[PDB]
Write a protein that binds this ligand. Sequence first.
Ligand SMILES: O=C(O)[C@@](O)(COP(=O)(O)O)[C@H](O)[C@H](O)COP(=O)(O)O
Ligand SMILES: O=C(O)[C@@](O)(COP(=O)(O)O)[C@H](O)[C@H](O)COP(=O)(O)O
Ligand SMILES: O=C(O)[C@@](O)(COP(=O)(O)O)[C@H](O)[C@H](O)COP(=O)(O)O
Ligand SMILES: [Mg+2]
Ligand SMILES: [Mg+2]
Ligand SMILES: [Mg+2]
Ligand SMILES: [Mg+2]
Lengths: 140, 140, 458, 461, 229, 350
Amino acid sequence: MMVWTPVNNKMFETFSYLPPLTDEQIAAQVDYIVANGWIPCLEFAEADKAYVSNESAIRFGSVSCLYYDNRYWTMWKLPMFGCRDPMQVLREIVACTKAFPDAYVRLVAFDNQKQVQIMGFLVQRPKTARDFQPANKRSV
Amino acid sequence: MMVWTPVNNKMFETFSYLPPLTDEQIAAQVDYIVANGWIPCLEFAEADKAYVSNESAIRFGSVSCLYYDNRYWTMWKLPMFGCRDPMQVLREIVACTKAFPDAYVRLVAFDNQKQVQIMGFLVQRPKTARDFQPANKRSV
Amino acid sequence: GFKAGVKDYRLTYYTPDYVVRDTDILAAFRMTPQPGVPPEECGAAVAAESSTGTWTTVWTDGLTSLDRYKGRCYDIEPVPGEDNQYIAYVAYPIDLFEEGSVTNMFTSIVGNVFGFKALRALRLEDLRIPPAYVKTFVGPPHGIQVERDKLNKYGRGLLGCTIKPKLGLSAKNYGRAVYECLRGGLDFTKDDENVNSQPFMRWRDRFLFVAEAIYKAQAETGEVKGHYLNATAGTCEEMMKRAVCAKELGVPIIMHDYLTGGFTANTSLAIYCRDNGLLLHIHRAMHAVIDRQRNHGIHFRVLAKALRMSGGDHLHSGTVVGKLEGEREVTLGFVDLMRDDYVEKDRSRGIYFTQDWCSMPGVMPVASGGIHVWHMPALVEIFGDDACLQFGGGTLGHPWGNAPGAAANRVALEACTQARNEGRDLAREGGDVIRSACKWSPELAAACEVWKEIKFEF
Amino acid sequence: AGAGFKAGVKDYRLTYYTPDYVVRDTDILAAFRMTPQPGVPPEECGAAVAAESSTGTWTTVWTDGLTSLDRYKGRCYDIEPVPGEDNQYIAYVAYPIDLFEEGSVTNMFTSIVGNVFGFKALRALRLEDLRIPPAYVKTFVGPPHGIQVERDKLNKYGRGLLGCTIKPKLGLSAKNYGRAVYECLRGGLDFTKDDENVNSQPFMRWRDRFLFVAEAIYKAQAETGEVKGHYLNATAGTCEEMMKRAVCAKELGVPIIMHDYLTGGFTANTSLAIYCRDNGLLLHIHRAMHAVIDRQRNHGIHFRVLAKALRMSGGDHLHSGTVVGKLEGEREVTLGFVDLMRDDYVEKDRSRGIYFTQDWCSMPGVMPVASGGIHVWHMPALVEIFGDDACLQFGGGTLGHPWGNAPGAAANRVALEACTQARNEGRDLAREGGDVIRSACKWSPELAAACEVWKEIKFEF
Amino acid sequence: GAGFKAGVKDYRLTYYTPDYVVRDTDILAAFRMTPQPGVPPEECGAAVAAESSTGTWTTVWTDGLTSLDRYKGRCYDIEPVPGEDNQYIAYVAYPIDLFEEGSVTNMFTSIVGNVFGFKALRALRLEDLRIPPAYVKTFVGPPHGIQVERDKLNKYGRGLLGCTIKPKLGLSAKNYGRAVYECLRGGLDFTKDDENVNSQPFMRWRDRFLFVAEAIYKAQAETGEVKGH
Amino acid sequence: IVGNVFGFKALRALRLEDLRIPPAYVKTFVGPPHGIQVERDKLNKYGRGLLGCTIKPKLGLSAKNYGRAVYECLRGGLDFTKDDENVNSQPFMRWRDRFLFVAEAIYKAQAETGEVKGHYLNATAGTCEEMMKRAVCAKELGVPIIMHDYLTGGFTANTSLAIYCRDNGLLLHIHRAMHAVIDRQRNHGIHFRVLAKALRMSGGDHLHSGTVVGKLEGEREVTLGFVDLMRDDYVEKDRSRGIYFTQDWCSMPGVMPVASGGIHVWHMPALVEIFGDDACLQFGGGTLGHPWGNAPGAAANRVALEACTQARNEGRDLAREGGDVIRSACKWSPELAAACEVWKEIKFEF
Ligand SMILES: O=C(O)[C@@](O)(COP(=O)(O)O)[C@H](O)[C@H](O)COP(=O)(O)O
Ligand SMILES: O=C(O)[C@@](O)(COP(=O)(O)O)[C@H](O)[C@H](O)COP(=O)(O)O
Ligand SMILES: O=C(O)[C@@](O)(COP(=O)(O)O)[C@H](O)[C@H](O)COP(=O)(O)O
Ligand SMILES: [Mg+2]
Ligand SMILES: [Mg+2]
Ligand SMILES: [Mg+2]
Ligand SMILES: [Mg+2]
């Protein structure tokens, strides 16, 4: 019987329960994005503004249901509309991680028909980050 | 095609749509009463206090649902408990009509298990009453 | 200890040696297992998955006392004349249920089990609601006695009438038809179950005109009159608005579709009716989706007990003889369940459990649907005085109009009551009583003439 | 000369059977699976259904002349015989829009399924589908949020959502309830839920539960850094109670409540959906008691109808069945009504039980929830059936794990995330299903302990 | 193709679609358009359709995040006006999704909100609207309507007769009631406050209401006919 | 005044050009909830125009996307963003969803820039009850400002809302949707100056004044006049400006003119010249139309405005050296440069 650790095992939504994505597993997802016609986009946030919190709810009445800060990240350039080139997306991932080496960075895709974000996973965790666990030390 | 008259065709609950009860039809009802163990009783009312109205609702707020004046009539003597004698009931009807010749009078019977009046029909209409129709002149 | 993995339900939830407690709720299921699923296991699956159990073993069981809280299959009868059908008996502890909530009781007892792959069909035939659970319900707003006392009506059935056509009439015409029916000698008229508020007739317009009719007919006949105004609605707030308006208008009675409305809305309305002295007429619209088939569903007697608890002064009982199905023996049984304080187990009537209602008022049965004057004696014979009999087509289908139509039915009903009272046996001299009355009443005669040939037998 | 009042019975088919009728764009259409009594002509039986669910009774009434029966009558306009069936027909009825109260599922059901099912003149009746026209659809508030808005509020994209009914159903104290909830949620589940019959009871009073669950939600959310929810139950005996509980949930700031729409009822349910819209609560709908109505093929109402109904009344999630789990659900029909729940426009498709083209005219979609007797092995099948827009729930499949809830949760989350990656990578889940799971068991110790325990377990009969 | 291209372009490129088949649920507007000299009718019609629906003056990138096809107003037909040099009827179709259920306010805000003030046109007139049933069903609509009114009032088989009290302003509440009583008892069904009779220093509203109420009831008792004000 | 007379057979056309609202009548009105001074004090913003931006496309965006766009615009340096006048509550985006996401955007941008931010959440609605419901939610969210379409909503609803705003300290932005139906033609209708006096009395903190130079009509001299009527305490008769009466507002607060619609960075100096500091300038397309997105778009406009303000302050005459000030700033700011490049040729003259 192994025990799942409460310290500091912070996750990151889709795919953060799998082993970290290889540069090629990332590329495979980008193929799936362009395969389906979806719009790719990059978002980033500094170490603080990355996790969901609620310090603006100090200004609220009883209306803080489904309100959390730091849902929104900062948009890297614009979303890439009708840009059907897998190569060019991977290049933008690089340009972005390069400009913000200390940021969290995630890749997202929008479906414009349903008008909703259709996928999204993390591509860069900052180096200073001490609040996650490697995939093997999650249970002791 | 005959038309049912609105003037003045006032009725009186149970049996008032049949032809008026013969002294022996009355007696047949009283047999039914005694046969079933029910308590017989006589009630009466003067010409005004006979019909359902609502002049006390002038004192009410919005609470006059299922409130009507003149539901209660005046009890003749007392109910005849365990009195299993059909003869004596008929005598009391006579006693009462004799004492109040100008009153409406009705025979009623109580079930004490269910605690409810279990039957009731009119036995005397006052002579001055001009607001009823004989059984044949109800439709023209 | 905790042993992960699947095991048989029967290990934990089949307990044939269990003594039922006076406070247990008991369910009688008509079970039809899949081929090769042993009856004991099926019965235990039902007991499990309507109480404490899921499909694989959970550790959290140890935190509590499963012995205290588990549903228990405690007896299985095979069904005579049936290869693969059993009556499974489940006992549920009282602690399983929210006080005063029919909705909760149904959620547990009929919530999921009916959908199990491991069975072909399931039917809930009866529940035993123990006194200590019955005491947790407000129950009917008034009940038969109080209703009779409020209306000042005794010693005969009550007479009602659904306005027709079901939909299509304006408020003004609705009231017009109402006045004519009421003044002829009917006690009640009603909105049709699906008359709510629609483009052709908005509810408040109807409520006003109906109020007016009720008052005209009452002043004219000198008898107390009523019309069941429909409070059934999209939302509780709309349902309540309508009830409040009925109250404000002084009218004595409203109706609700408890099944299409729902138990939660219905209990809310019953409580409002208790608190404001409104009589509550319950229409069972949609019951036949659930109670028609013998193999699968919930039997009507259970939907009736349920409504008695939630709250209603009238509940439609069926006619037996009219246009909608209703077998005689089973009907007499659930009418007893509706009306009586104590009803002894009687399998010949479909009554699987002794039901003690511990003083909860009784609900009045309403017999409605394709019945006319010829049925009168049969109806008076089945139901007795404590029933409401309704003639929709039976009144607005009379050749001389509503007033005559009403008069006809009133006379027919009074005649049969007198006859019954005089000693005549209604089951035999039925036709005779009616015939004597037609030769006597012109309005009744016109009615007998038109529906003489009309019967509902298949 | 004319058309006057003629007292007495006649056939329904004279007025209510109109096979030459052109259906209007605004008519509500019904598809009944009719089974007449022997010797009752199909045409007459269908007209009876149309009549007694609209404007007609059993004998001719005079009041008909005051109004225009033409304008308002229900109309049986087509009858198909059923292949492989002696005495079974599909009767098509058209009801004018005027027959119905705006925004009222309750009223629609009252007309269409009110009385007819109980007719002596038929052996069985089953409502298979309804065509709710745009002009009626637009009268409903409909779902409080819908799939897109839910995903936006919760900030969750690109995969199914994971849920979990706490067990045992009944018997757990409030403190223990929250305990379990915290442990499931921290392992990687998105949601947990009250069991449908967990309301307020002697062993656990609802306000105690709501408080402890709120604390569990917030602990788990702070620990994982992912948004968490638990469907607190607002199902209650009275509307006033039901509202009290919704209000408390709002007051706690928790994201989501649940309602048993059929046992609570449509009136109560529409009320709650309106409250949820007005306050930003997500509403999870449990379909307790549907099987009493929708299980048999000959009689009742088919679930796809009960699902259109819930979509109109209001819900953010609706239970859709699993196909592969412990409760019945045929695959093709399920794919159909899931489309009915989720999509804006669904073309007629009889292979899937869809009798009518349904245009939902922008009413938000309801998220299907697949729950009941599923475990990790079922994962690929589930992802294959439902896609991303669903929520998968593992009650036993979580609290039944040998290592407890957090490990249980973790297992399921890995299982789902693996299939999603595979799917995305091009791997066909219908074939390579077992492979994806197996790769992931040899990789994750928690998933492995799970696979081991439920490897033999299937639901086929 | 089809990415984000900054800069102004012609409205006609996106908002003039003369090959469009109107849907049964679209709201349709008929505008009497009068473009500035040298502004092509097609472009002026599309400007109107754009700026009353989804479009602004330069291209915005956010268009890509949604489906303009689904949401855009469409100029779909232009008739020239006989006997008119520079006047056209432009036809605009708006998807139902554009509008708030039950809100006349929202409808007028879109349709007649900004466009009438465009530099690119001399004049604009909205001549008609096609309110589709599926939009109409979202309104409560009139409280009663002709039939129900007549039924309430118990008045049938003739025009109804009303009368605006005069002088418009200046009368005291008591005089107002007096005049009202005299007009109603003559055989008028209705009298009325003048549109600008609200509540003023010479006659406060609650005063009027009370006296009018009295006039209504006197006239009604006297004539035996139902009376209103 | 405008009830019946415009429809008389005895005349061909009628136009109301001005009204003289006497102090004794003015004093009977609550008037604007806050007014220019109080607004500036509340927002802590001084010594320049305010910058706003209508989210685009007008309709079609989801709540989540709306908030996303809002955050990007606000963090670039705009003071305000706003719902489009016809953004109320619709199938594609329900109002409460929008209000919540926008609130989040407002707070993120505020924390990031350290400047006070706002978004005019639209309270315009079908019924007063709905209008109020929306205002209450905005208050409950702590957001500083809401908007109303006073003409399509109507005066009665508007005055109600203004009073609510006064009572709860909400800023009220007024959109004049539909005015052009009434005020466009010279021969018939009501002139806008009258509709502006009216709004000032009914209540509003901002009122759209037109641009003169942008996509919608507005002659310069008349505009300068009614802007004075909106802002000032005392305005002398001046027929050259269409002001037929001396208007004394007897201390009723002033309404802030909002200049919006088809304007971009090249218009900046003309705008600063016309309105001065006490105005709000709005760039919808002018922001979401920028080739690098909203944040850059915002930054561009903010720089353009700050430059013109400095120039003005330093003595430079903006009516002449206009193009110069802008040009200096493009060669200096990459974001502004990209903006100037795209809309250089774009003008509105007919
Ligand atoms: O709609 C109808 O058919 C009725 O108004 C009867 O009309 P008629 O009297 O004209 O036949 C009742 O609702 C049915 O009795 C319901 O059936 P049940 O009582 O079995 O629920
Ligand atoms: O009570 C139960 O059985 C469940 O909590 C599942 O528990 P497990 O995951 O432990 O099986 C759900 O309520 C069922 O899914 C209902 O069925 P459906 O979704 O078909 O309505
Ligand atoms: O809908 C529009 O066009 C705007 O959002 C401007 O958008 P852009 O900045 O993208 O042009 C404004 O509502 C107009 O300014 C209204 O005109 P006015 O101020 O005259 O009332
Ligand atoms: Mg009915
Ligand atoms: Mg459950
Ligand atoms: Mg006037
Ligand atoms: Mg705008």
